[PDB]
Design a binder for this molecule. Structure first.
Ligand SMILES: NC(=O)C1=CN([C@@H]2O[C@H](COP(=O)(O)OP(=O)(O)OC[C@H]3O[C@@H](n4cnc5c(N)ncnc54)[C@H](OP(=O)(O)O)[C@@H]3O)[C@@H](O)[C@H]2O)C=CC1
Ligand SMILES: CCc1nc(N)nc(N)c1-c1ccc(Cl)cc1
Length: 217
């Protein structure tokens, strides 16, 4: 009855502290969420961060063949009632797909999926599934051999999956720095997600950061 568990749908993101503004109705100097800044002008708020990229890459790439068996059965039973290299699935919005550096798209060692009702195969020469909605993602997953399904961006992609309770875990990176932002991470029922992993602190050129993991418990 839990699709996020049956199809191992997780979410991964990186958020920073929002940089204040002296004009407008959007300045929150006492926000209860110190880390809510997701993007700024179609780009990352902090630009580049070697550690986070390394972490994100590792996480969304790692596969354990010695664990797929259990997963295959879990999905077979559900479906009831192709010798393809085992890989994870990454799901992104059109913007995110259009920002990836040419030499990184499609994401290496990963099955890429882009949510869009505008793009077409004719215009994208790279291998990647294009879907109209989350419902189509579900369909795709029901008939696709993969390890885990990672949602990597952006705002609305995250917001629809949460509200539809399709998220088993959340990989949350906390960038410790203030940056101007215009896109933020959506809010969710914190109560149904308990923090199950708290990493040590890390440093990326004076900018500290850490990695958390919440599990729908
Ligand atoms: N720090 C982090 O971890 C992350 C940061 N970001 C940042 O976020 C900003 C991008 O934000 P945003 O424009 O929201 O990004 P998206 O990548 O979601 O692009 C929006 C577009 O994606 C499509 N889309 C989004 N949701 C859906 C949906 N539910 N169904 C179908 N299509 C959908 C639409 O395409 P169409 O119009 O073709 O239908 C849409 O107009 C950037 O600055 C990026 O760097 C993004 C992810 C993670
Ligand atoms: C390395 C950035 C990064 N770090 C973390 N922690 N989570 C993410 N989801 C992304 C990310 C954002 C946009 C694209 Cl297009 C690909 C990945």
């Amino acid at each position: 009855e839990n699709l996020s568990d049956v199809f191992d749908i997780y979410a991964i993101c990186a958020c920073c502290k929002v940089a204040p503004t002296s004009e407008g109705t959007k300045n929150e100097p006492f926000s209860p969420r110190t880390f809510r800044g997701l993007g700024n002008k179609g780009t990352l708020p902090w630009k580049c961060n070697s550690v986070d990229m390394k972490y994100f890459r590792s996480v969304t790439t790692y596969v354990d063949e010695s664990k797929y068996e259990k997963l295959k059965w879990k999905r077979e039973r559900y479906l009831r009632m192709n010798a393809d290299k085992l890989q994870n699935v990454v799901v992104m919005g059109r913007s995110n797909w259009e920002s990836i550096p040419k030499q990184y798209k499609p994401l290496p060692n990963r099955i890429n999926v882009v949510l869009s009702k505008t793009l077409t195969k004719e215009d994208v020469k790279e291998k990647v599934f294009i879907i109209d909605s989350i419902d189509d993602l579900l369909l795709l997953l029901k008939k696709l051999k993969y390890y885990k399904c990672f949602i990597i961006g952006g705002a609305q992609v995250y917001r629809e999956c949460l509200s539809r309770n399709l998220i088993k875990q959340i990989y949350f990176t906390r960038i410790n720095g203030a940056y101007p932002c215009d896109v933020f991470f959506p809010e969710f029922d914190e109560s149904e997600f308990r923090v199950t992993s708290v990493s040590e602190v890390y440093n990326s050129k004076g900018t500290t950061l850490d990695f958390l993991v919440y599990s729908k418990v």
